[PDB]
Amino acid sequence: GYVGIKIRLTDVAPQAQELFKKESLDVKENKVYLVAATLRPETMYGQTCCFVSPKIDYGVFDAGNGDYFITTERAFKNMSFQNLTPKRGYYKPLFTINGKTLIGSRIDAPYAVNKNLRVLPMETVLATKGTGVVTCVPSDSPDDFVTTRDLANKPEYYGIEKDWVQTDIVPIVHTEKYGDKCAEFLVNDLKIQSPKDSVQLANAKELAYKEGFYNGTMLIGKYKGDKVEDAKPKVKQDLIDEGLAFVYDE
Ligand SMILES: Nc1ncnc2c1ncn2[C@@H]1O[C@H](COP(=O)(O)O)[C@H]2O[B@-]3(OCc4cc(F)ccc43)O[C@H]21
Numbered sequence: 012g013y014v015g016i017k018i019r020l021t022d023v024a025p026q027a028q029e030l031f032k033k034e035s036l037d038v039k040e041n042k043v044y045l046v047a048a049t050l051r052p053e054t055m056y057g058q059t060c061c062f063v064s065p066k067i068d069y070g071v072f073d074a075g076n077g078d079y080f081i082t083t084e085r086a087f088k089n090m091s092f093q094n095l096t097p098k099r100g101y102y103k104p105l106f107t108i109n110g111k112t113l114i115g116s117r118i119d120a121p122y123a124v125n126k127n128l129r130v131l132p133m134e135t136v137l138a139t140k141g142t143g144v145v146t147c148v149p150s151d152s153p154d155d156f157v158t159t160r161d162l163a164n165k166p167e168y169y170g171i172e173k174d175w176v177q178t179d180i181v182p183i184v185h186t187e188k189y190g191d192k193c194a195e196f197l198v199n200d201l202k203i204q205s206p207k208d209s210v211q212l213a214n215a216k217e218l219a220y221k222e223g224f225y226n227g228t229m230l231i232g233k234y235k236g237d238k239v240e241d242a243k244p245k246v247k248q249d250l251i252d253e254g255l256a257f258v259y260d261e
Contacts, residue, residue, distance in 0.1 A: 012260035013048040013141055014247060015090075016121060018061050020045060020081075024115035024130075027108070034106055036071070036079070043071070043079045045118065045130070048086075048141025051223075052247040052256065053239055054148045055122040056231045057183040059159070060176065062133035062145040063110035069143060070104030073097060081108070082142040090259055115175065120146060121255035124231070129175040133158050135206050149194060150180050151223060153215035156194040158206045184227040184239060191230065193219050 020043045023031055031038065045061055063069070072087045074080045075097040080087060088102040096102070116130040135154070136145055149156040159176060166173040182191035189196040197203075197215040206212075227239040233249070234242035250256035 012258055013050060014052045014250070014256050015142065015259055016047045016049055016052070016055065016146055016250075016256050017044040017254075018047055018121070018144075018146065019043070019119040020116060021119055022117040024113060027112050027116065030106065030108065030112070034071075036105065041079060042077055043081070044074075045081045045113075045144050046086075046142050047144040047146040049146060051148070051151070051243075052250055053229070053234075053243040054151050054183055055120070055146075055246070055250070056124055057148045057150045057181060058120040058123040058128065058146050059125055059149055059180070060129055060131045060147040061118055061120060062136065062147055062155075062158070063113050063130055064136035064138070064143060065109070065111045065114075065132050065134065067110050067136065067138055067143050068107050069110065069113075070102075070107050072102065072104050079105070081113075082144060083138065085139065086142040089261055093259060095257060095259060114171065121250060121253075122232070124181055125177055131162060131171060131175060132169065133206075135209075148183075150183050150192045151194050151219060153194045153198055153203065153212055153219060154206070156198050157203055157208075157212070160198075161206060182230050184223050185230050186222045186227050188222050188226070189219075193223060 020038050069081050070084045072080050090096050091102050113130045118128045120128055147155045149159045163176045163178050185191050186193050201211055203211050229235050229237050229242050
């Protein structure tokens, strides 16, 4: 399965404000989270934004105890069958919301060293996979790097502001094969120039996974200096113990 990462919504975009007001959902008084699905919890130190898709209608769900989750309905339904929600098999949202409506919102992401994070559009999110929410780590995810490059090179065109997208990458994982920002290395080496180059991106993804997990060393956090292979379960358990993440299966 995946690790779900609880990314706190701190201020909603203007186009969303009316909607949240109507449903008496105040993001400063209730705990409203975008829940991103990841397989690399050890890289959370390097989140530079959170991605949603313009093509997806998300639900805002009651997750109990004053928490609310923003995910696909598919994902929340699965969560209800493994004790992560207030009632087994119950998955009606309070309301639905299209990804475009959330663009520009402000967020706080667990363990991120960068501050002032925003919600940004990713056109290539697979609707049927995970939660439909993907957190952005350009140092080590080739998809994230390439999408970040396109947004930063033409922000006005994509309907975003340039200050929303961060291009100064702080290194998180050291490898001998690809240096300290393996996604940058691989995107250049394989000459990947578009987010829709799917077959090449999958090749880059797997090369990055292998080298990083088995041969990489942490450059940051409590486990700085440890091998990623040893540090990764510890980071995951730390996040879970602190209420910042959970596991779920599909
Ligand atoms: N609906 C969706 N559409 C597109 N991409 C999605 C997605 N849900 C999650 N992801 C992305 O794919 C990784 C798992 O891929 P596989 O399952 O192995 O193919 C996840 O972990 B990862 O999170 C942070 C991260 C950092 C990193 F250095 C590398 C990867 C990721 O990005 C997520």
